[PDB]
């Protein structure tokens, strides 16, 4: 007897539950609807859903009124929107968290075992007809094929939005503090507990590793002068795990906090920048608090980075991405009047979704030189040869690639893409259209509609046989982008919620923590309140190069 | 130069912070006050603090209007108060949590290292003149002396409030799921992570131990028929740690979830009762969901106990304790309109405070027999010899001891008391009066005032030299009780906040979780909504004995 929940009869976030041998029931509790499948709108929901404009429309206003916006920007109407932006977006992420790779239901285990990534939608029942549930073919497209055929870059397509490489890496770096899938435990698990912006990719993810990195003096971190400039320490001083290739594990084999940060200069660059910051903070703190110990100078300075980070990530990172005229803003107080849980738990869908590998170029331009992946990957001196000033200047100038539209992932890393598709299936993530709903959108009625064109569209149907069958990662990357956008609708509408629920759900953002005493002094609080990419750099370098999340000119 | 924060210059929860070599500053942020030490009430605080009646007064109304209360009880005015009761009481507990045994400031470490118990007030600076800070003698009273002289029971003083032993144990049992100080790590640390009502004293506190206890079939737990009645399994089947004395580790050496539950029949009794429940729940669930696996039948049934527990603990446990005419009530929805964090973290002060050892009798009456501690402690067959029905009936009839008033802890366990006093000092908990403030009360101006009498009072002063110097545990137990109360003012006013913040801050209490689907079915939800002590027993026994949290007649 077919598992009814295989059809996903419940609507609007109604919980599907098997009763007896062949029946089911939806728990439409607090879903705003009632009825067998949560299909009958309560008096207000009805009002709500009739007056609610399309997401497509909002993205429009947000990206057009270049006069009305400068006005809105200069007035309170700004925080109003920001506050609105937040609350509404974050309301879509269950918290306390729901299910994981092991439980398609609420459980104490799911709640407390920080190891499991968490999922938004349950998984595709292990007993459903098709791999996606009801519709599709008894076999999903060969992921190796799908990759090359639709995600493989032909000619490099740059981000119309002007994004650069200085951004591309910051992105990669930044995301690796919460995305750390444990190979040992397998997909659906993570080493990066904490699940947020704890910078456990600087201070490592365990107390020891931290201690191995901590110079237990002046709250500072270990480091080593090369060329007269500051850099991270090598394992010989910072005796901690890494993944540098078997070759020269002594010198140039720097310790950082994120195991894999030796594998690319980009990551290491930032690693250096932050470390040089932390210690910089300590120098400031210690002058304000001579009577202070080490443990303090450390923890306090930490929080000052968990702040600075959350600030730049919002008023600069997401700003660029958005393409909004509305000037996003980070002010924890905007939620002090709302019902918000200051707690996060990274999800698998969020993980998948953030696989923006196509941002990567073809080669890497550094002034006149032009390193190829071979010269770049695992290189180990570019950083010290060239220098932060110079390297940053070089990334802040080379365009990054459009993330959506399809076919723009360089071939070298195209393997990642395939794995995600393979992993997803292991994870048993519901179909693209299913996630469209859960994130307040309408399911696409055809590939022709999904993709703005007709070619891929037609061929994809030939493959999945039914648009519903379509999968998560592929749909996201193969969806048509908003005009001149770095990517399409589904990315923003599924990303921002995960993205903000996580940014603001950081304890330091709570009323309890958001005090100038938590950053010991007013000086600390300001560093947080006035952080900038331009300052995260030029305040830790000899000279001030060009740095931004977008190309100049 | 004396560490200024040694005087506790900041008021109303203002954070004290050292600046330079000899100065300090208070962070009166969101404290309702402003000024050098948070001593100048904002316009409303002033209104608030002038119109706010004394706690002594409230306890009065709550304990007198036996007509107006039956009326309030029969109307909505009930939930209004309940909601009021909650929110206000819970607002006094910082969340996300603040400090721990290692940090007297906010830190990422403090936030995430679930191992550290957390503290409400920072600790007494390791560089202050007196052990308590400013006032007192360079040496605290000899804890062994203090014990015998003021906490040692002379003549057994029963709880005027009518409390019985059926309650005394439930209490002990129940509290040991969140109070588990790790001897290895020392004071200020805990094995019981989760920090709440997760029943990790039934299902143990680690996945393995759980699995060793789990009968991986029908979601049920292992057990063994003795006399035809159900009991927990012995290590031989449930190969898990315990602490039964080196003697007969095979039979009668039952596994439970809480290492130390073999050490007293009382604890084991309850252990049996709950287990017999869980499996009982499973039987109900499995009939409603034949198509269900084991992992589910398990987790679901669990939550149904995390519910039932939180229900009884509130509408019966705290009810008895309170002595209120207001009929306390458990309905998670009452907070769905408030700003509440569904997260808890047990504190050291809460731990200390809950050391209600004087509830314990002199001997233990069981029908005509009358076991003494020697026959009772570590006994190992009383339970199976006598039986749940009978044993419960026997506890529900023997009075428990008044908790406050001083001098009423039986001699056998009087050692615990001394340790707490010794531990506290290791912990460096601020003075009694200091905690009085933090919990919205006025500091006592004399021992004569603390204690309703004159004898102890006079002698205690001779000891501490200054009422301020007075300590936490002693003050709590030596404070005069409200007339006919089981204990005094400070206990309720410091306990309820910790107690409720914890009860309601349970994830299952959130809007997200509080659905009938989380307890799979309506049947589950009702078991939670209608749990009773009388039912936790008589629905898992052959006959229905006398059971209540208070003596009959
Ligand atoms: C978060 O959640 C993950 C799980 O999803 C946790 O990691 C996993 O943890 C489990 C259990 O700790 C582990 O178990 C695997 O299952 C094997 C099966 O074990 C056998 O079958 C039962 C189960 O107990 C027993 O009856 C068997 O008999 C044994 O009984 C004796 C009693 O002392 C044993 O001493 C003797 O060995 C005997 O055989 C037997 O145990 C288990 O044996 C095997 O070790 C295996 O590991 C998973 O492998 C863990 N790993 C993962 C990623 O799944 C993780 O710990 C959780 N995080 C936290 C912090 O809680
Ligand atoms: C919650 O918080 C508690 C701490 O409050 C955690 O438990 C404690 O964890 C610490 C660190 O893991 C542990 O450390 C103790 O300190 C000893 C000092 O170590 C030496 O001094 C420094 C510190 O790293 C090093 O420079 C020394 O040199 C070493 O460097 C080599 C590098 O590989 C080493 O291999 C070699 O040994 C060399 O000596 C040296 O390490 C430490 O050595 C000792 O082991 C000791 O344990 C505490 O003891 C832990 N226990 C407690 C209760 O305090 C707990 O883990 C946290 N919980 C979680 C989950 O995070
Ligand atoms: C938007 C962020 C971002 C960027 C710019 C990026 C850029 C690059 C890059 C360019 C120099 C290379 C060679 C790689 C190479 C890899 N990446 Co990423 N990755 C990124 C986010 C991720 C994530 C997320 C994972 C999955 C594992 C995890 O961390 O949980 C990942 C995994 C991988 C893996 C392991 C297998 C797999 O999961 O498919 C390889 C190899 N990569 N990555
Ligand atoms: C109100 C609950 C309660 C009760 C009724 C109770 C009843 C009894 C009892 C009567 C039969 C005996 C013989 C003991 C004996 C002990 N108890 Co308690 N204890 C209780 C709550 C605690 C707590 C809390 C601790 C501290 C350790 C922990 O669990 O964190 C404790 C600790 C102890 C210790 C270890 C040393 C110490 O911390 O002082 C002994 C021995 N006991 N206890
Ligand atoms: C790693 O990067 C360095 C640059 O820091 C590479 O060396 C440069 O190579 C180019 C041509 O490939 C020369 O024209 C530059 O003069 C070199 N820089 C210097 C002074 O060394 C190096 O080849 C890279 N190694 C790898 C792994 O390919
Ligand atoms: C443990 O408890 C049992 C009761 O279950 C004790 O045995 C009883 O002892 C009394 C007198 O002490 C006798 O009058 C009862 O008849 C006994 N019950 C039976 C039938 O065994 C036993 O003595 C206790 N053991 C310890 C540790 O003292
Ligand atoms: C609720 O969801 C079910 C599940 O798809 C809907 O479908 C069932 O009933 C339909 C009405 O005739 C049939 O077309 C389907 O065969 C049948 N399928 C299943 C899985 O039971 C049901 O109609 C929905 N009800 C509402 C209110 O739309
Ligand atoms: C704020 O707290 C300090 C700390 O006790 C108060 O005391 C300081 O100033 C007093 C005023 O003369 C002196 O009596 C104390 O010697 C001095 N002690 C310290 C620790 O500095 C201070 O007066 C308080 N201010 C207010 C507004 O009451
Ligand atoms: C969990 C830590 C933070 C993780 C997220 C960080 C960056 C996320 C990347 C992209 C987010 C969505 C992109 C579009 C933003 C739209 C903003 C809005 O319209 O609201
Ligand atoms: C953390 C899990 C729950 C821990 C607490 C359980 C029981 C606590 C014991 C006593 C609490 C305070 C006693 C007085 C109650 C007054 C109620 C009120 O006036 O508000
Ligand atoms: C026009 C923008 C007004 C201020 C922000 C309103 C909320 C924006 O945020 C998001 O907008 C999406 C539409 O694109 C909706 O689908 C989301 O539910 C909503 O949270
Ligand atoms: C500010 C102008 C646009 C506002 C309308 C955004 C659409 C409302 O957003 C909806 O809010 C519900 C909250 O009850 C969520 O449960 C829904 O999933 C979400 O789509
Ligand atoms: C008279 C009771 C009215 C309904 C409950 C009001 C809040 C009760 O709760 C508590 O009462 C104490 C007084 O004893 C106060 O000190 C606490 O701050 C308050 O939270
Ligand atoms: C319902 C009748 C009694 C209500 C008055 C209770 C006294 C108010 O309670 C106060 O509330 C503050 C919230 O801003 C807390 O910070 C204080 O610590 C607390 O004592
Ligand atoms: O994208 C769909 C369209 O929705 C409409 O509401 C807007 O006016 C258009 O600007 C937008 O392109
Ligand atoms: O306890 C102090 C006293 O406070 C007064 O407000 C009440 O009317 C008394 O009943 C109470 O005993």
- DSSP letters, A213-244, are HB--STT-B--EEETTEEEPPBTTTS------
d(CA A2, CA A24): 11
d(CA A358, CA A403): 5
Question: Judging by beta carbons within 10 Å of its beta carbon (0-12, 13-18, 19+), is residue A54 exposed, middle or buried?
Answer: exposed
CA A533 to mean position of chain CA atoms: 18
d(CA B496, CA B92): 10
Contacts of B108 by beta carbon, 8 Å cutoff, 6+ apart: A198, A299, A302, A303, A306
Residue carrying structure tokens 């019966």: B316
Which segments of A216-337 does DSSP mark as H helices, in order?
265-288, 294-312, 319-322
DSSP B508: G
Could you tell me which of A445, A444, A455 has the C-alpha nearest to residue A490?
A: A444
Spatial contact of B232 and B251, defined as CB atoms under 8 Å apart: no
3-state DSSP call for residue A32?
A: coil
Spatial contact of B400 and B359, defined as CB atoms under 8 Å apart: yes
d(CA A551, CA A548): 7
Give residues after which chain A gaps, C-N over 2.5 angstroms: none
Spatial contact of A462 and A114, defined as CB atoms under 8 Å apart: no
Please indicate if any CB of chain A lies within 8 Å of the CB of B17.
yes
Please indicate if any CB of chain A lies within 8 Å of the CB of B23.
no
d(CA A169, CA A85): 26
- CA dist B255 → A171, B240, B260, B302, B308 (Å): 50, 7, 10, 18, 22
Could you tell me which of A526, A512, A181 has the C-alpha nearest to residue A343?
A: A512
Return the structure tokens found at B314: 């509130």
d(CA A416, CA A418): 5
* H/E stretch holding A27: strand A23-27
d(CA B341, CA B343): 5
Instruction: Work out the angle between the directed axes of helices B165-175 and B265-288 (0-180°, nearest 10).
Output: 70
Cβ-defined contact of A106 to B292 (cutoff 8 Å): no
Please indicate if any CB of chain A lies within 8 Å of the CB of B98.
yes
Return the structure tokens found at B428: 């460096």
Q: Whose CA is closest to atom 16 on ligand 5?
A: A369
Could you tell me which of B113, B152, B168, B181 has the C-alpha nearest to residue B424?
A: B181
DSSP A409: B
Q: Nearest C-alpha of chain A: how many angstroms from B28?
A: 9
Which segments of B66-221 does DSSP mark as H helices, in order?
68-74, 77-90, 108-112, 143-146, 165-175, 207-213
> φ, ψ for residue A231 (rounded to 5)?
-140, 170
d(CA A30, CA A25): 15
Tell me the β-bridge partners of B17. Answer: B25
d(CA A234, CA A465): 54
Q: List all residues of chain A from 278 to 307 with a beta carbon under 8 Å from chain B.
A: 288-292, 295-296, 299-300, 302-303, 306
Question: Judging by beta carbons within 10 Å of its beta carbon (0-12, 13-18, 19+), is residue B165 exposed, middle or buried?
Answer: buried
d(CA A323, CA A316): 11
Contacts of B16 by beta carbon, 8 Å cutoff, 6+ apart: B4, B5, B8, B9, B10, B24, B25, B26, B122
All structural domains of chain A with their residue ranges: 2-42, 43-552
Please indicate if any CB of chain B lies within 8 Å of the CB of A477.
no
Spatial contact of A489 and A479, defined as CB atoms under 8 Å apart: yes
Q: Nearest C-alpha of chain A: how many angstroms from B112?
A: 7
Q: Nearest C-alpha of chain B: how many angstroms from A550?
A: 32
Contacts of B254 by beta carbon, 8 Å cutoff, 6+ apart: B231, B232, B233, B234, B235, B238, B242, B262, B268, B271
| Terminal-to-terminal C-alpha distance of chain B | 63
Spatial contact of B267 and B172, defined as CB atoms under 8 Å apart: yes
Could you tell me which of B470, B478, B545 has the C-alpha nearest to residue B141?
A: B470
Using CB distances shorter than 6 Å, the residues near ligand 9 are A 85, 89, 178, 196-197, 313, 318, 321-322, 492, 495-496, 499, 502-503
- Which CATH number is B2-42 given? 2.10.25.10
Which ligand is in closest contact with the Cα of B344? 10
Could you tell me which of A312, A313, A320 has the C-alpha nearest to residue A486?
A: A320
CA B373 to mean position of chain CA atoms: 24
Q: Whose CA is closest to atom 60 on ligand 1?
A: A113
Return the structure tokens found at B389: 């029905």
Q: For CA atoms B274, B280, B286, B289, give the dihedral sign.
A: negative
Spatial contact of B98 and B120, defined as CB atoms under 8 Å apart: yes
3-state DSSP call for residue A207?
A: helix
Cβ-defined contact of B290 to A520 (cutoff 8 Å): no
| Terminal-to-terminal C-alpha distance of chain A | 63
Spatial contact of B256 and B333, defined as CB atoms under 8 Å apart: no
d(CA B364, CA B384): 16
Q: Which of A95, A109, A517 sits opposite B15 (nearest CB)?
A: A517
Q: Whose CA is closest to atom 28 on ligand 7?
A: A37
Spatial contact of B485 and B452, defined as CB atoms under 8 Å apart: no
Could you tell me which of A373, A318, A340 has the C-alpha nearest to residue A496?
A: A318
Please indicate if any CB of chain A lies within 8 Å of the CB of B107.
yes
Q: Where are the beta strands (DSSP E) in B36-146?
A: 40-41, 99-100, 118-119
Could you tell me which of A194, A278, A171, A202 has the C-alpha nearest to residue A506?
A: A194
Tell me the β-bridge partners of B200. Answer: none
Cβ-defined contact of A19 to B292 (cutoff 8 Å): no
The CA A295 to ligand 2 mean position distance, Å, reads 14
Burial A395-413 (b: 16+ CB within 10 A, else e): bbbbbbbbbbbbbbbbebe
Q: How many CB atoms are closer than 10 A to CB A426? A: 11
Spatial contact of A518 and B96, defined as CB atoms under 8 Å apart: no
d(CA B361, CA B158): 8
Spatial contact of A82 and A328, defined as CB atoms under 8 Å apart: yes
Return the structure tokens found at B287: 């009939």
d(CA A363, CA A371): 6
Could you tell me which of B276, B359, B219, B314 has the C-alpha nearest to residue B509?
A: B314
Please indicate if any CB of chain B lies within 8 Å of the CB of A195.
no
Identify the closest residue of chain A to B97 by CA–CA distance: A512
Spatial contact of B49 and B434, defined as CB atoms under 8 Å apart: no
Could you tell me which of B500, B120, B172, B504 has the C-alpha nearest to residue B348?
A: B120
CA A198 to mean position of chain CA atoms: 14
Spatial contact of B211 and B238, defined as CB atoms under 8 Å apart: no
> φ, ψ for residue A254 (rounded to 5)?
-70, 140
- CA dist A283 → A301, A312, A542, B465 (Å): 9, 22, 17, 44
d(CA A429, CA A117): 13
- CA dist A409 → A154, A272, A363 (Å): 9, 28, 13
Q: Nearest C-alpha of chain A: how many angstroms from B247?
A: 35
d(CA B388, CA A232): 65
d(CA A102, CA B208): 16
Active site residues of A: 176, 354
Please indicate if any CB of chain B lies within 8 Å of the CB of A338.
yes
Q: How many CB atoms are closer than 10 A to CB B367? A: 11
Return the structure tokens found at A221: 């971190």
Spatial contact of B101 and B349, defined as CB atoms under 8 Å apart: no
Contacts of B280 by beta carbon, 8 Å cutoff, 6+ apart: B539, B540
Which ligand is in closest contact with the Cα of A379? 5
Half-sphere exposure for B197 (CA within 13 Å, toward CB) = 27
3-state DSSP call for residue A419?
A: helix
CA A318 to mean position of chain CA atoms: 10
Could you tell me which of A332, A300, A309 has the C-alpha nearest to residue B15?
A: A300
Half-sphere exposure for A84 (CA within 13 Å, toward CB) = 8
Task: Calculate the CA dihedral of residues A26, A29, A30, A33 and round it to 10 degrees.
Answer: 50
Spatial contact of A345 and A195, defined as CB atoms under 8 Å apart: yes
Q: List all residues of chain A from 409 to 438 with a beta carbon under 8 Å from chain B.
A: none
Could you tell me which of B282, B315, B330, B328 has the C-alpha nearest to residue B523?
A: B282
Q: For CA atoms B525, A27, A437, A79, give the dihedral sign.
A: negative
CA B460 to mean position of chain CA atoms: 27
Spatial contact of A201 and A214, defined as CB atoms under 8 Å apart: no
- CA dist A205 → A200, B112, B114, B123, B487 (Å): 5, 11, 15, 28, 46
Ligand 15 nearest atom to the CA of residue A53, by list position: 6
3-state SS record for A314-364: HHHHHHHHHCCCCCCCCCHHHHCCCCCCCCCCCEHHHHHHCCCHHHCCCCE
Task: Report chain A residues whose CB lies below 8 A from the CB of B102.
Answer: 295
Return the structure tokens found at B392: 């419960």
Q: Which of B27, B295, B343 sits opposite A103 (nearest CB)?
A: B295
d(CA A106, CA A91): 18
d(CA A247, CA A238): 18
d(CA A443, CA A445): 6
Which segments of A12-67 does DSSP mark as H helices, in order?
43-51, 55-61
d(CA B423, CA B348): 10
A43-552 shares the fold of A2-42: no
> φ, ψ for residue A348 (rounded to 5)?
-75, -35
DSSP A192: -
Tell me the β-bridge partners of B18. Answer: B24
Give the number of A-B residue pairs with CB atoms closer than 8 Å. Answer: 149
d(CA B377, CA B148): 22
Pair type for strands A23-27 and A15-19: antiparallel
The CA R_g of chain A, rounded to the nearest whole Å, is 24
Could you tell me which of A220, A253, A228 has the C-alpha nearest to residue A238?
A: A253
Spatial contact of B177 and B199, defined as CB atoms under 8 Å apart: yes
DSSP A400: -
Q: Does domain A43-552 have CATH number 1.10.640.10?
A: yes
* H/E stretch holding B364: strand B364-366
CA B134 to mean position of chain CA atoms: 31
CA B462 to mean position of chain CA atoms: 32
Could you tell me which of A343, A345, A308, A303 has the C-alpha nearest to residue A203?
A: A303
Pair type for strands B229-231 and B224-226: antiparallel
Cβ-defined contact of B105 to A520 (cutoff 8 Å): yes
For the Cβ of A72 lying below 6 angstroms from any atom of ligand 11, the answer is: no
Q: What is the DSSP string of A77-137?
A: HHHHHHHHHHHHHHTTS-SS--EESS-SS--HHHHH-TTB-EESS-B--TT-SBTTBSSS-
d(CA A126, CA A143): 20
Maximum Cα interatomic distance, chain A, rounded to a whole number of Å: 73
Spatial contact of B250 and B383, defined as CB atoms under 8 Å apart: no
Tell me the β-bridge partners of B505. Answer: none
């Amino acid at each position: 007897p077919v598992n009814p929940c295989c059809y996903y009869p419940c609507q609007h976030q109604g919980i599907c539950v098997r009763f007896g041998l062949d029946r089911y029931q939806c728990d439409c509790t607090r879903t705003g609807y009632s009825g067998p499948n949560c299909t009958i709108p309560e008096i207000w929901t009805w009002l709500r859903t009739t007056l609610r404009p399309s997401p497509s429309f909002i993205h429009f206003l947000l990206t057009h009124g270049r006069w009305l916006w400068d006005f809105v920007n200069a007035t309170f109407i700004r925080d109003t929107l920001m506050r609105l932006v937040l609350t509404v977006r974050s309301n879509l992420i269950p918290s306390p968290p729901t299910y994981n790779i092991a439980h398609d239901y609420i459980s104490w285990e799911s709640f407390s075992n920080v190891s499991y990534y968490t999922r938004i939608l349950p998984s595709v029942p292990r007993d459903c007809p098709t791999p996606m549930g009801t519709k599709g073919k008894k076999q999903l497209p060969d992921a190796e094929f799908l990759s090359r055929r639709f995600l493989l870059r032909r000619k490099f397509i740059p981000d119309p939005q002007g994004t650069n490489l200085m951004f591309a890496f910051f992105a990669q770096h930044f995301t690796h503090q919460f995305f750390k899938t444990s190979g040992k435990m397998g997909p659906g698990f993570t080493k990066a507990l904490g699940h947020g912006v704890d910078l456990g990719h600087i201070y490592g993810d365990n107390l020891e590793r931290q201690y191995q990195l901590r110079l237990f003096k002046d709250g500072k971190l270990k480091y080593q002068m090369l060329n007269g400039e500051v850099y991270p320490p090598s394992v010989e001083e910072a005796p901690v795990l890494m993944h540098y290739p078997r070759g020269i594990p002594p010198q140039s084999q720097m310790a950082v906090g994120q195991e894999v940060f030796g594998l690319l200069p980009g990551l290491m660059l930032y690693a250096t920048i932050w470390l040089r910051e932390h210690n910089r903070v300590c120098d400031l703190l210690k002058a304000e608090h001579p009577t202070w110990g080490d443990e303090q100078l450390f923890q306090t300075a930490r929080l000052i980075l968990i702040g600075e980070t959350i600030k730049i990530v919002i008023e600069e990172y997401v700003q660029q991405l958005s393409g909004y005229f509305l000037q996003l803003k980070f002010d924890p107080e905007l939620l002090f009047g709302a019902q918000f849980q200051y707690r996060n738990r990274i999800a698998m869908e969020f993980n998948q979704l953030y696989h923006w590998h196509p941002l990567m170029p073809d080669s890497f331009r550094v002034g006149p030189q032009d390193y190829s992946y071979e010269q770049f990957l695992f290189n180990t001196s570019m950083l010290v040869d060239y220098g932060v000033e110079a390297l940053v200047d070089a990334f802040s100038r080379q365009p990054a690639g459009r993330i959506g539209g399809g076919r723009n992932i360089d071939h070298h890393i195209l393997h990642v893409a395939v794995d995600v598709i393979k992993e997803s299936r292991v994870l048993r993530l519901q179909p693209f259209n299913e996630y469209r709903k859960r994130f307040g959108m309408k399911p696409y009625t055809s590939f022709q509609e999904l993709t703005g064109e007709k070619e891929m569209a037609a061929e994809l149907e030939e493959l999945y046989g039914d648009i519903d069958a379509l999968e998560f990662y592929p749909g996201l990357l193969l969806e048509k982008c908003h005009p001149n956008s770095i990517f399409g609708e589904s990315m923003i509408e599924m990303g921002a919620p995960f993205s903000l629920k996580g940014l603001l759900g950081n304890p330091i953002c709570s009323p309890e923590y958001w005090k100038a005493s938590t950053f010991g002094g007013e000086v600390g609080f300001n560093l947080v309140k006035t952080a900038t990419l331009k300052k995260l750099v030029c305040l830790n370098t000899k000279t001030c190069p060009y740095v931004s999340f977008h190309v100049p000119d």
